[PDB]
């Protein structure tokens, strides 16, 4: 009814203004709850009518923020769930409760994601090891702070210059006692000679195995490729997107250049061009291993997860 | 005269038959002593006559063991000493001879303190809790590591050489100094290269490219260290630097009897098999990071300059 459009408009302008909520798994839970509220607050006879409905609100919700893909791919996963249930019921009226319980299955699958990645983390960390991360990500800090229960090693958390978010990861890892080392972002190739492996997170995994992530991680991947150290992308499968990299150049999220060059700089701000991209593109050849809630996978396998999680008719959404 | 002739042929048959003396600096000292005995026990009026005498005996001395290039380039440096002093005295019979003798004695007193000068600069390349990888056995790298271990604590992964495991010697010589060394086979090099911080090896002969022949299995070690982008230290003195280009002549690798690879008690499969045992291997200069000699650290993009500072281009074919 009307409250449905209230919640939809609140979510849309919440994504338009800022980050609400802060981390992305909460955003996937809100998106799936909003989608189950959408499918329980409408009337339809065919599944295709609900498909156009969900496509319309997905177009609106991804036009709210093109840089954040979790809502769009969650809408796309709900679309594939609807298509699979319509295909298994076609070969009618019991469709709605089946989609509700399938989305509930997806929510129970999704709530135990970071702890499933944490459970398989001990198979990748040995004692007295040098780890380098970038940015701040709750997946990687849960990974490391539970792998530190039985191992003793070293983590070099490199801050990112636009928003020094690696400082929060540093003060969160030092509470667990992992010998946290804080450095700048300019010393990454200066310390790549001693880092044994690089364990980072991401914002969005693309269809070809590539990933957008916090900016400066393409440099980190190049330095780790030069030193041949393996890259561990601790990423869940709601950061899996079928969007190819070269698509209307709407890849990077540019923010106000205040965090790079402040407004009190002078008259030189008029004759200067300051860019602040908070995301960066990493090709799949610079990635060694993905760690998802189903296990470890190669970058030569993400298209298969793509075909297992999304339908090719909904790539345009 | 006759004593000098029998000394020359005892040395040449010692190099033809086996390894006499044991390590390479001893052989460089024997070569310099033999050459100073040559220039003190002959008669010459012009320097070119003595040049052709040194060339005629050095040709046989390098035809004894072509893999042992220390005698050859040591003779070649003596020839450049002859040419330098004849040029400085031409622009001359007894003063020239005594100047050659004192310059060769200068060469001996710089050559004797080579390993201690390499050890003195070892501390600027080794930090504490570092993983070092070594192939073969060499007195230069052993003095390097046991000098750097007087103030630093690190680790050494010494790898044995598969034909005859000479690196086991280095292990029992390193563990006497308390290095926390690690012995493995050379089948695990790329298995362990992901944790080795620096690779420090020796060599047998530095070529004019910056390339080097060394104990076999070190080209694989250089490839594994290039894959992992770890730097290479070649603890080599300045008498293992030869002007012979790699692909110029034949007889590069020294092949030995295949007994050390496949024993004679194998059976009748020895008659239908081809067993090779190359005890040397060729490492191109692009897989090498840094040379450490008695004059300091140098790039592989600099060895040709040391060639032109130590040898003359007319004596390359000798």
Contact B194 A193 (CB under 8 A): no
Residue of A nearest to B225 (CA): A227
C-alpha span between A294 and A283 (Å, rounded):
22
Q: Pick from B2, B92, B18, B11: which is nearest to B49 by CA?
A: B92
Task: Spell out the residues 6+ positions from residue B147 whose beta carbon is closer than 8 angstroms to its own.
Answer: B119, B120, B122, B123
For B175, phi and psi rounded to 5 degrees? Answer: -70, -15
Task: Spell out the residues 6+ positions from residue A71 whose beta carbon is closer than 8 angstroms to its own.
Answer: A15, A27, A28, A31, A61, A62, A65
Contact A193 B227 (CB under 8 A): no
C-alpha span between A252 and A67 (Å, rounded):
7
Count of A-B CB contacts under 8 Å? 14
Q: Find chain B residues with C-beta within 8 A of A229's C-beta.
A: 194
**Using CB atoms within 10 A of its CB, is residue B114 exposed (0-12), middle (13-18) or buried (19+)?**
buried
In eight-state DSSP terms, residue B124 is: G
Residue of B nearest to A129 (CA): B195
C-alpha span between A212 and A209 (Å, rounded):
10
The residue length of chain A stands at 317
The pairing of strands B290-293 and B296-298 is antiparallel
Q: Pick from A104, A79, A73, A95: which is nearest to A203 by CA?
A: A73
Q: Is the peptide bond before A21 cis (omega within 30 degrees of 0)?
A: yes
For B282, phi and psi rounded to 5 degrees? Answer: -110, 130
Q: Are A172 and A148 in contact (CB under 8 A)?
A: no
Q: Pick from B240, B168, B242: which is nearest to B204 by CA?
A: B240
Q: Are A199 and A144 in contact (CB under 8 A)?
A: yes
In eight-state DSSP terms, residue A48 is: H
C-alpha span between A242 and A76 (Å, rounded):
9
Instruction: State how far residue A230 is from chain B, nearest Cα, in angstroms.
Output: 10
- In the numeric block, which tokens belong to residue B287? 């897989």
C-alpha span between A130 and B197 (Å, rounded):
12
Q: Are B241 and B206 in contact (CB under 8 A)?
A: yes
Q: How far, in Å, are B54, B182, B185 from residue B81 at the CA level?
A: 12, 44, 44
In eight-state DSSP terms, residue B246 is: T
C-alpha span between B283 and B304 (Å, rounded):
16
For B242, phi and psi rounded to 5 degrees? Answer: -120, 145
Instruction: State how far residue B159 is from chain A, nearest Cα, in angstroms.
Output: 21
**Using CB atoms within 10 A of its CB, is residue A257 exposed (0-12), middle (13-18) or buried (19+)?**
middle
Test mutation, B228, B231, B232, B289, chain A, max A CBs within 10 A:
B228
Q: Pick from B308, B237, B318, B245: which is nearest to B84 by CA?
A: B308
In eight-state DSSP terms, residue A268 is: G
Cβ neighbours of A308 (radius 10 Å): 11
For residue B291, the surrounding DSSP H or E stretch is strand B290-293
The residue length of chain B stands at 318
- In the numeric block, which tokens belong to residue A250? 């709407």
């Amino acid at each position: 009814g009307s409250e449905l459009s209230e919640r939809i408009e609140s979510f849309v302008e919440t994504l338009k203004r800022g980050g609400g909520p802060r981390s992305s798994e909460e955003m996937a839970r809100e998106t799936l709850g909003l989608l189950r509220q959408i499918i329980t607050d409408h009337r339809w006879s065919n599944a295709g009518e609900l498909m156009e409905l969900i496509r319309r609100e997905g177009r609106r919700m991804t036009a709210a923020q093109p840089s954040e893909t979790t809502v769009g791919n969650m809408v796309r996963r709900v679309l594939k769930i609807i298509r699979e249930e319509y295909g298994r019921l076609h070969g009618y009226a019991q469709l709605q409760s089946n989609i509700i319980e399938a989305i509930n299955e997806l929510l129970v699958e999704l709530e135990g994601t970071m702890e499933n990645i944490a459970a398989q983390a001990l198979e990748h960390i040995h004692s007295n090891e040098v780890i380098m991360t970038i940015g701040f990500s709750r997946t990687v800090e849960a990974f490391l702070k539970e792998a530190a229960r039985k191992r003793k090693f070293h983590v070099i958390v490199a801050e990112c210059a636009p928003f020094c978010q690696g400082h929060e990861m540093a003060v969160n890892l030092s509470k667990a006692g992992i010998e946290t080392t804080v450095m700048t972002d300019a010393a990454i190739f200066a310390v790549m000679s001693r880092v044994n492996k690089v364990i980072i997170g991401t914002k969005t995994i693309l269809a070809n195995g590539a990933l957008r992530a916090v900016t400066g991680t393409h440099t980190l991947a190049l330095a780790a490729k030069h030193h041949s150290t393996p890259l561990i992308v601790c990423a869940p499968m709601f950061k899996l997107s079928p969007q190819f990299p070269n698509e209307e150049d709407s890849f990077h999220k540019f923010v106000a250049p205040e965090e790079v060059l402040p407004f009190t700089e002078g008259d030189i701000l008029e004759k200067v061009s300051v860019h602040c991209p908070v995301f960066d593109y990493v090709p799949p050849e610079l990635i060694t291993l993905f760690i998802s809630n189903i296990g470890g996978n190669a970058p030569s396998y993400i298209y298969r997860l793509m075909s297992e999680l999304y339908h090719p008719d909904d790539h345009v959404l």
